[PDB]
Write a protein that binds this ligand. Structure first.
Ligand SMILES: CCCCCCCC/C=C/CCCCCCCC(=O)OC[C@H](COP(=O)(O)OCC[N+](C)(C)C)OC(=O)CCCCCCC/C=C/CCCCCCCC
Ligand SMILES: CCCCCCCC/C=C/CCCCCCCC(=O)OC[C@H](COP(=O)(O)OCC[N+](C)(C)C)OC(=O)CCCCCCC/C=C/CCCCCCCC
Ligand SMILES: CCCCCCCC/C=C\CCCCCCCC(=O)OC[C@H](COP(=O)(O)OCC[N+](C)(C)C)OC(=O)CCCCCCC/C=C\CCCCCCCC
Ligand SMILES: CCCCCCCC/C=C\CCCCCCCC(=O)OC[C@H](COP(=O)(O)OCC[N+](C)(C)C)OC(=O)CCCCCCC/C=C\CCCCCCCC
Ligand SMILES: Nc1ncnc2c1ncn2[C@@H]1O[C@H](COP(=O)(O)OP(=O)(O)OP(=O)(O)O)[C@@H](O)[C@H]1O
Ligand SMILES: Nc1ncnc2c1ncn2[C@@H]1O[C@H](COP(=O)(O)OP(=O)(O)OP(=O)(O)O)[C@@H](O)[C@H]1O
Ligand SMILES: Cn1c(=O)c2c(ncn2C)n(C)c1=O
Ligand SMILES: [Ca+2]
Ligand SMILES: [Zn+2]
Ligand SMILES: [Zn+2]
Lengths: 48, 505, 146, 48
């Protein structure tokens, strides 16, 4: 229910919610969430 | 339908992606349903009688379209066989006379009759194509336009890229009263207006789609049933010119229709001059499938072949520059000492000479220019000739031949890959044969009884034909997904056997 | 057996039995399988070559007849393109076997009003008939090997 | 050989994850599993 109510926020922040997986200090795979800047994404998308 | 299915399977397995596989499959099912309707319509069973005869004639043409094409090919071959007996003379059978030289004397009337028959058959082929294949072209165009309008807001939220001639032209049918003529969904405009309208404006959407909002409610409120006469006056009044213009633009941009039109134009020119009928002998490439596949080897790397020819031209130009600057004395192609004929006294002539003679020479330009033995530039000139031979004659031509050979290999690899993919993995769920074959003939049973794609096509037709109030729970579920264009009901990486592995064991 | 019997009518009929090497030697059979694997495509390619050469013959017969005099005696000209059958035979027989195409075997066009048309004619003949179609045949054989 | 190199690169990218090296077959046990894994879980642009 909370996710459905936050659908608009999640859709708006989808291009900026960066997600990766790492092998953490606990010897387990951990998912990391961070912020991708708009300038960073645009520079990445530049054709060169 | 079997040929269409084979073509679709080849396309999806070769160039299609996994993400859009089910969407492409459903699109193929829709196209197949429309083509089945067309086939059923054309199947064999004053205004009224004339209309009946017209419909019968058009149905006959559509039914025998391919036979008519084969007949056109045969007539072209016969005409050219007769043309092989042509002759030229200075006296009638300083102007020159062309006439047939045959002992029988029946060839010339036969030539006239065959030419007239060929023109007639070409016209009939055009009509048959228009009545058989054009409907599917219009159906696909309308379907794509409707989907882009509804689920993408192509002309509402976005706009065509201004280079998409297809979108720029499709802007002409949006307000037309008959936009969905072949596409089954006759309520695309209502759907688009309801989702798009609050954010874009109902009146703006109604103007873009040529909808009368006032009559929109009245049509649902009550029922109107007209009964116009079939008179030509009424028919002319009831013609959507804007739709017909858009439709004719689509048709005239269709490739096969353009080919048939060129065929007809050449047939007509054949009556101005009979030798124009030789152009129709090129129809063998389109007719014979083996020849089409063979020519696909040449056309697969056509861009690379053209670029290689351009590179050859540039290299020959460089050699021409060197020859014009240093080796002009060797380019005298005249045996009369009084009248020398220098082929490299101007750059244009030297370049023409090189590209024309040296490239076609077995050993290069050195085969065709003066022998350099005893000259001060003997070594420079032998290096010139040898490098020309090795680069232009040996390597570049080898590049062309290797391009053709690689095209052959690539096409064979594509066919083998399609066959292997179909024989080793399920088209629907994507699970490999190895898993199913744990049971005797497991993959065969799975692909013929459990996940048969023909059965999914049949289920779509069955859902369309069945009354909605009679739909079962699963039928209603799948019907709602079909209407919403959600393809999640298709099993993906899962099956009944995997679901109930322990119980079924 | 029939050829062996005919060999007694004329001894040179025994040369037909030398073709038995293809059936006898397994290596030769496998080698010839490379030619016969795409035999239908090879035949279709030969037919396409015939059609293309016929088109070139039509063009030459309609526009380039003057260049097809194959006689060095001015009193007795020998025109190879004054009739379509003769022109087609000349093309299919000489131009296809010529190293550089028909232009190798017909009159030099330098100085003629149709010089550019005729050089385009010769170059396109060379590239389509000599370079591409023969390359198609060779590639068919190579692909059969593979 | 050049065509084979291009095809091999395409096949490797389409059948195995660039980061963890696990093949598509495993991820595809879930619908569009490989696509989701390579676009949301182990996207290399996200590591950048
Ligand atoms: C895919 C690659 C395509 C290759 C394109 C074609 C090249 C292939 C062939 C090379 C063999 C011939 C090399 C050139 C020798 C020419 C003879 C020579 O040189 O006689 C000495 C000259 C005499 O000078 P002059 O005063 O009497 O007349 C100058 C005044 N005029 C020019 C207006 C009359 O001395 C001089 O001028 C100094 C020389 C001029 C400066 C260098 C220009 C020549 C360059 C040639 C190409 C270089 C790469 C060679 C590699 C081979 C292919 C890989
Ligand atoms: C795989 C592909 C196979 C290709 C088949 C072979 C074609 C390859 C070659 C092309 C080079 C030559 C092009 C033709 C030029 C001819 C010279 C010319 O045109 O002189 C101007 C003429 C003079 O006319 P007239 O009144 O004096 O004699 C007319 C009365 N008669 C004919 C009875 C004597 O003007 C005219 O007639 C108007 C011209 C006649 C109408 C066009 C027919 C010519 C078409 C040629 C092929 C077109 C494609 C070209 C692409 C190249 C290959 C890809
Ligand atoms: C996209 C177009 C290219 C596709 C292939 C079509 C090839 C032909 C070309 C082009 C389009 C039409 C060209 C213009 C035609 C206008 C008519 C014309 O101007 O015609 C002139 C001469 C006719 O002379 P006349 O006045 O004495 O007639 C007697 C009539 N009275 C007595 C009344 C004078 O026409 C002649 O004679 C020469 C006729 C024989 C020419 C050969 C035609 C077919 C064979 C080879 C060419 C194929 C090219 C292959 C390239 C495609 C590769 C995929
Ligand atoms: C399906 C059939 C084709 C398979 C290959 C067989 C090739 C030969 C052909 C065909 C079938 C039999 C043809 C008709 C034979 C009837 C006899 C005949 O009419 O014979 C005439 C002359 C004999 O003359 P005479 O009267 O002076 O004899 C002296 C006798 N007295 C003195 C009594 C007059 O025969 C001669 O001289 C010429 C004899 C030498 C010809 C070469 C034979 C073998 C070498 C090359 C040809 C192979 C073709 C390869 C194609 C197959 C590719 C897979
Ligand atoms: N989901 C699937 N549905 C049907 N066939 C599948 C499926 N997945 C893989 N296949 C394979 O596709 C091939 C289908 O067989 P095939 O096309 O010969 O059938 P058909 O009905 O006789 O038609 P056609 O005669 O036109 O080939 C078989 O190899 C089958 O194993
Ligand atoms: N870890 C990964 N991260 C991203 N893509 C991966 C990864 N592993 C495999 N792939 C595959 O690599 C391809 C990446 O797609 P693609 O390069 O087309 O993306 P893009 O962002 O649209 O860029 P481009 O337009 O330059 O190709 C897809 O086939 C994806 O399945
Ligand atoms: C998906 N789909 C169709 O494909 C279809 C249809 N009516 C005809 N077709 C062809 N309906 C109502 C439908 O929902
Ligand atoms: Ca019910
Ligand atoms: Zn399956
Ligand atoms: Zn991964």
């Amino acid at each position: 229910n909370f996710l459905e109510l936050a659908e608009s926020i999640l859709e708006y922040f989808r291009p900026y919610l960066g997600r990766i997986e790492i092998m953490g200090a606990s010897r387990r795979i951990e998912r990391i969430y961070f912020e991708i800047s708009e300038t960073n994404r645009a520079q990445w998308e530049m054709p060169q | 339908v079997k040929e269409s299915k084979r073509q679709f399977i080849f396309d999806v397995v070769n160039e299609g992606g996994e993400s859009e596989k089910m969407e492409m499959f459903v699109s193929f099912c829709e196209d197949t349903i429309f083509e089945m309707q067309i086939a059923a319509q054309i199947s064999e069973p004053f205004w009224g009688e004339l209309e009946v005869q017209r419909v019968k004639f058009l149905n006959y043409l559509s039914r025998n379209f391919y036979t008519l094409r084969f007949l056109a090919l045969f007539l072209a071959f016969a005409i050219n066989f007769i043309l092989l007996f042509y002759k030229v003379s200075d006296s009638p059978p300083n102007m020159v006379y062309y006439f047939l030289e045959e002992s029988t004397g029946y060839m010339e009337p036969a030539l006239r009759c065959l030419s007239l028959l060929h023109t007639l058959v070409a016209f009939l082929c055009i009509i048959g194509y228009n009545c058989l294949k054009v409907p599917l072209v219009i159906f696909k165009r309308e379907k794509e336009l409707a989907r882009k309008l509804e689920f993408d807001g192509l002309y509402i939220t976005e706009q065509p890229e201004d280079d998409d001639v297809k979108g720029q032209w499709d802007r002409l049918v949006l307000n037309t009263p008959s936009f969905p003529s072949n596409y089954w969904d006759k309520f695309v405009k209502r759907k688009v207006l309801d989702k798009h309208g609050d954010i874009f404006g109902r009146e703006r959407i109604a103007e873009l789609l040529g909808m009368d909002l006032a009559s929109l409610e009245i049509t649902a409120h009550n029922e109107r049933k007209p009964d116009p006469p079939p008179g030509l006056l009424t028919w002319i009044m009831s013609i959507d010119v804007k739709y017909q213009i858009w439709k004719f633009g689509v048709i005239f941009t269709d490739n096969s229709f353009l080919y048939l039109g060129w065929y007809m134009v050449m047939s007509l020119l054949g009556h101005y001059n009979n030798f124009f009928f030789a152009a129709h002998l090129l129809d063998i490439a389109m007719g014979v499938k083996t020849l089409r596949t063979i020519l696909s080897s040449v056309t697969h790397n056509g861009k690379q072949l053209v670029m290689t020819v351009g590179l050859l031209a540039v290299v020959v130009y460089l050699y021409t520059v060197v020859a014009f600057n240093f080796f002009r004395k060797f380019y005298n192609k005249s045996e009369d000492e009084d009248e020398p004929d220098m082929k490299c006294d101007d750059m244009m002539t030297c370049y023409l000479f090189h590209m024309y003679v040296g490239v076609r020479a077995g050993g290069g330009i050195g085969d065709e220019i003066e022998d350099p033995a005893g000259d001060e530039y003997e070594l420079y000139r032998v290096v010139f000739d040898i490098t020309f031979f090795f680069f232009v004659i040996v390597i570049l031509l080898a590049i062309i031949q290797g391009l053709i050979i690689d095209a052959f290999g690539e096409l064979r690899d594509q066919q083998e890959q399609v066959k292997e993919d179909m024989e080793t993995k399920c088209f629907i769920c994507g699970i490999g044969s190895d898993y199913f074959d744990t049971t005797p003939h497991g993959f065969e049973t799975h692909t013929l009884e459990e996940h048969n794609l023909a059965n999914y096509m049949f289920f779509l037709m069955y859902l369309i034909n069945k009354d909605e109030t009679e739909h079962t729970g699963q039928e209603s579920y799948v019907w709602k997904m079909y209407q919403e264009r959600c393809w999640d009901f298709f099993p993906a990486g899962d099956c009944f056997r995997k679901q109930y592995e322990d119980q079924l064991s």
